[PDB]
Design a protein around this ligand. Structure first.
Ligand SMILES: Nc1nc2c(ncn2[C@@H]2O[C@H](COP(=O)(O)OP(=O)(O)O)[C@@H](O)[C@H]2O)c(=O)[nH]1
Lengths: 159, 79, 636, 239, 159
């Protein structure tokens, strides 16, 4: 995953540096439990940094067993665009390792990969390598961070 | 989550345009809180949302019934 | 474990030493001289340690020291003398301290290494050399609502008394530090169950006319969240009064130089205490408004400023554990967690470039005794585990090595059902606390701060303590040392258990790691659920609840509480905030920007607070801290 | 073999123990001189004495165990079952004062605990009137429950042997033993226990010590909680 | 007084005995062996008391007598078993009775001569072997007035 947290820090940096001169519209997308049919859209339990009328937040579910998104994802993205707001920030739920569905409908895609992955050279077989803007890893409370950073940089150089 | 601002709660609900509001207030003194919630809701035409409360046995039946008549659908008793 | 291993090894060494000595003493009566025994004895003595050898040689002097009636010790320029003998009703003469009758050296060395006389290393059986005399320094606590009525009550109760010790309990709004406003939600519960304050003005008016410079006076306020901010307020008031004093005596603006001299003097001389803590609240309710690390760093910076400005008498650190047991924690778990928290604070302070010898003696601890047998020895362990850690691991001052504690009764054991029995069984709690060389004893009701206005019960609450310390016969002794096995046995067992729990905590990935993972909350929940299960099942019986009920039933006629506040008081406080706000609209912005700059640039936030508090709102301060990101998030 | 009323009059602890044991030994010798063998009656003698506020009571029973036992082994060689000595302990109502009687319930707990720690053969928790001249009431529940509180739930009660971890026990034991033996020597020099009963030596000793105690009491040099100070300014209606 | 004097004398004697024992034990490691010490040990043992010597020899048996959880004793025609371990809410296991941890025989002898475990010579610490279990015989004292009234009260109480 990786939502919210980095979004939290980004939002705080934006507000603190530009004195809240930008209107951010953020939409999150969450998966749906296939068995009971329900869902748990628990991502606004995170940062309270939406407390400003100029900034809007909205949560949505996948609604689908096949994809991670609803049938109107690009349409709702354009609908968010049409409000003459400063910026659109969209979360992208979670699938396994073969999903890149958000790219064809987004200009910038900030990607994040979990520190707990080990996989000394399995990032190579991981699909989403040369399809993003900037690498992101959190939770440096564990060791081997320098090694993982170096290997990621080398793979990015190769790709 | 818990200990969330009333103004924040209502504003977020208008942001998400939700169907119901669930609150567990076992701390007491819920009368002013719920009255403020109801007034703020009726301030901006969001009456479609439903209100249900739970606070244990703090509310006597007459008091909770009066608040219910003010517009909240129910308050769920423990017993 | 290494300390104990050395103990065992040197004990065997001493046994060998006295063995060989008495051996040759007997042998010389035989005439035949085999000198190799003397060589072995010399070798054994050389292999022995030195400091322990001095301690062992001190023994006859120890015996001759306490043989007489009055103890004398001439130190520095003074000489302290004190009587050590008391008289019973039947003419039997009782020593306040009793010394071992042993003669075999090994036991002597072991006991001197594990359980010395009090007032000596390693302070197992109490820090002070002897028990202080009577006239307990029992603070009287009273605080609720506005500053005027609280000051009225303070004057009411403190009248005609020299040794003044006040305790302050603020309201919840202050603890959460949210700025009150027109909203009835915050306006409603305000002012009840505490004293609500908003600005430096109201804080000063609360403590109007009371000589904060009186050396024999103490003020202790209980709050942890805004602990930095209000602290500056207190400090500023500590200035303000005294400066105004000379304003009355001199009638002119003091010079900057003499102003600085006055500030330095009053800071050196002012006294107080704020029962502030971070770990317990985060572990207990998650009702923190700030990040744990954020608050800890702020506290460290404040300690840095205090050490830099060199105040040697006031402390604001309170490593308490009351709420942990209040939920129902197990005794050993409680002790281990408190010790871990304290040592974590010690390491954090070490990390900020401050030497150890400047803060160790200002730490404290606050925890409760229950009905389990472990409490009867708990304090013992509390002294021991700390003591050794200060000697070899860091080697702080002996005065720094000593540990002081606070003991309060546990209200969870005193259940409202059959309240009468609780008062009687509280005496059982008090007895062991007294036996363990209590440094400070509270006998409080269920509510920590008299949530309801109490009654004659406080008399009873006080009386029992007096009954023990002033008139109970056995209490004239202080040292259960030889003649009660369970003390030593349970001591060893509890020490081992606590060390093993320390090992577990270390293995679970760091103290802050456990904080992130909620290990402690889950452990406490599990054990509390087990406790309540046994309670409702009765596998562990409990008197007066599941059995021996009254056939007449328990009507329990009572009333809830009487603590109100007039709406006019709230309106007046609101417009007071309004006026103070409208006074300085241009000024607060500059201080807010400076606070931004300082927090961004890794500097002394408390320094900026010390100036902002004169001109900035508490609620504005909280919102600025939010803006910098200090808000506590929902990380369950 | 009771001495409860001896303490009730206000006797000193050591004197109480000494007089009680003197009475017991006198009965023993009186039976012995009648040509009756020892092993037929010794395990049947019983004792009845109370524990007061002074620290000696906290060890008092211990002495009663020791002094008897040795005397029964070398001097007569009775059976071991005969040699063992049984005793009774009851709360001391003298310490409880009618004034502020609410405090007496609290202060009885210390008396109870020291008796329990001494491995009593029995315990009685009794109100002021031993016969309840005024018929007692609800309060007895309390007087019972505390005993229950101590014996069924309090964990440390599972201890029965405090003997390495408190010096005062052993030291006071030796001191009390020596004092009691000295009092025995004085009694013997007084010309037999029967002679003492004739000339009233013990009455005079008890009277003198009781007067001493009352003098100290009304003086206030020796404090007594709840009476000589800390009086309620609201008066004491105490219905 | 004579009993205490005997205590002192035999205590110092036991000190002497263990002294000579450990002395010869240490001497055996140096190579030289002058046997006068063993003669002194024999003389002291002869001077040593008899019943007390048996009691001291009982000491390892005493240690084993309380090692486990329960204890059983054979007497007359039967045998009796009773448990001695208690468990706290903390899981801290508590022995009902604790024994001294001394090793030098002098203190051990004084302890065995002054204060044993309850239920042994000289019953210093308590006559009964082990604490009698709960359900104490709480008597009911009552009587006032005529015989008929007392009989009615007695019938009333013991139903
Ligand atoms: N220890 C630690 N935990 C973190 C950090 N950042 C986030 N977390 C927590 O780890 C959890 C795992 O989140 P994840 O599903 O991987 O992505 P996210 O839900 O968008 O944050 C989150 O819910 C955070 O509460 C960090 O820097 N350190």
């Amino acid at each position: 995953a990786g939502k919210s947290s980095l979004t939290d820090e980004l939002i705080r940096r934006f507000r603190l540096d530009q004195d809240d001169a930008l209107s951010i519209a953020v939409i999150s997308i969450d998966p749906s439990r296939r068995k009971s049919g329900g869902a748990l859209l628990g991502d606004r339990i995170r940062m309270n940094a939406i407390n400003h009328p100029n900034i809007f937040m909205r949560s949505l579910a996948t609604r689908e067993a096949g994809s991670e998104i609803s049938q109107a994802l690009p349409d709702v993205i354009a609908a968010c665009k049409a409000a003459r707001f400063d910026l659109v920030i969209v979360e992208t739920s979670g699938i396994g390792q073969g999903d890149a569905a958000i790219v064809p409908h987004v200009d910038l895609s900030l990607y994040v990969m979990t520190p707990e992955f080990g996989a000394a050279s399995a990032l190579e077989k991981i699909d989403m390598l040369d399809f993003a803007d900037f690498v992101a890893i959190n939770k440096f409370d564990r060791k081997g961070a320098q090694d993982a950073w170096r290997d990621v940089a080398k793979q990015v150089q190769r790709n | 989550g818990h200990n969330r601002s009333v103004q924040e709660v209502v504003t977020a609900a208008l942001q998400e345009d939700v169907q119901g509001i669930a609150i567990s207030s076992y701390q007491g003194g819920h009368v002013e809180y719920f009255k403020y919630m109801i007034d703020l809701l009726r301030e901006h035409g969001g009456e479609h949302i439903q209100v249900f409360g739970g606070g244990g046995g703090v509310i006597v039946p007459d008091e909770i019934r009066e608040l219910q008549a003010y517009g909240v659908a129910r308050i769920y008793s423990p017993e | 474990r290494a300390y104990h291993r050395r103990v065992v090894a040197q004990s065997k060494l001493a046994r060998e030493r006295q063995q060989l000595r008495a051996a040759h003493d007997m042998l010389q009566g035989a005439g035949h001289e085999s000198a190799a025994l003397e060589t072995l004895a010399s070798e054994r003595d050389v292999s022995l340690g030195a400091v322990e050898r001095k301690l062992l040689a001190m023994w006859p002097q120890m015996q001759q020291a306490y043989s007489g009636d009055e103890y004398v010790v001439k130190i520095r320029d003074k000489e302290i003398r004190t009587g050590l003998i008391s008289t019973t009703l039947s003419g039997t003469k009782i020593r306040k301290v009793v010394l071992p009758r042993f003669e075999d050296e090994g036991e002597i060395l072991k006991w001197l290494m594990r359980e010395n006389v009090p007032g000596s290393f390693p302070y197992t059986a109490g820090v002070f050399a002897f028990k202080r005399e009577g006239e307990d320094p029992t603070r009287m606590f009273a605080g609720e609502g506005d500053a005027f009525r609280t000051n009225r009550r303070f004057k009411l109760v403190s009248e005609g008394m020299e040794a003044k010790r006040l305790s302050t309990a603020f309201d919840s709004v202050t603890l959460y530090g949210e700025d009150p406003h027109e909203r009835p939600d915050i306006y409603g519960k305000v002012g009840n169950s505490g004293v609500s304050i908003a600005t430096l003005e109201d804080m000063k008016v609360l403590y109007d006319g009371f000589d904060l410079t009186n050396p024999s006076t103490s003020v202790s306020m209980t709050i942890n969240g805004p602990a930095p901010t209000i602290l500056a307020m207190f400090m500023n008031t500590a200035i303000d009064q005294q400066i105004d004093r000379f304003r009355a005596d001199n009638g002119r603006d003091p010079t900057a130089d003499e102003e600085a001299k006055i500030r330095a003097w009053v800071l050196q001389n002012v006294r107080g205490t704020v029962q502030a803590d971070i770990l317990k609240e985060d572990q207990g309710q998650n009702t923190c408004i700030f990040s744990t690390e954020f608050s800890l760093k702020v506290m460290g910076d404040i300690q840095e400023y205090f050490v830099h400005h060199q105040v040697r008498n006031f402390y604001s650190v309170s490593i308490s554990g009351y709420h942990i047991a209040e939920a129902g924690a197990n005794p050993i778990s409680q002790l281990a967690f408190t010790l871990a928290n304290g040592f974590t604070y010690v390491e954090a302070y070490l990390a900020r470039g401050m030497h150890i010898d400047d803060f160790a003696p200002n730490l404290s601890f606050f925890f409760s005794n229950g009905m389990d047998p472990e409490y009867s020895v708990l304090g013992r362990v509390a002294r021991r585990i700390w003591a050794v850690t200060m000697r070899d691991k860091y080697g702080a001052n002996d005065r720094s090595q000593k540990l002081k504690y606070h003991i309060q009764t546990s209200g969870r054991s005193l259940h409202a059902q059959e309240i009468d029995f609780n008062d009687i069984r509280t005496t059982l709690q008090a007895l062991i606390a007294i036996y363990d060389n209590c440094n400070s004893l509270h006998t409080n009701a269920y509510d920590e701060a008299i949530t309801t206005p109490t009654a004659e019960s406080v008399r009873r609450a006080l009386a029992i303590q007096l009954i023990i310390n002033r008139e109970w016969g056995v209490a004239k002794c202080e040292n259960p040392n030889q003649g009660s096995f369970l003390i030593e046995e349970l001591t060893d067992l509890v020490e081992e258990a606590v060390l093993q729990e320390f090992e577990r905590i270390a293995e679970r990935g760091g103290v802050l790691g456990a904080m992130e993972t909620g290990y402690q909350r889950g452990k406490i929940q599990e054990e509390s659920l087990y406790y309540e299960q046994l309670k409702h099942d009765g596998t562990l019986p409990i008197i007066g609840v599941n059995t021996f009920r009254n056939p007449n039933g328990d009507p329990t006629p009572q009333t809830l509480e009487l603590a109100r506040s007039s709406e006019d008081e709230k309106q007046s406080q609101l417009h007071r905030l309004t006026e103070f706000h409208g006074a300085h609209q241009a000024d607060a912005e500059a201080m807010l920007a400076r606070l931004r700059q300082a927090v961004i640039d890794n500097r002394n936030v408390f320094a900026v607070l010390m100036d902002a508090v004169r001109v900035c709102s508490l609620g504005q301060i909280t919102h600025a801290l939010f803006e910098v990101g200090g808000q506590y998030r929902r990380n369950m």
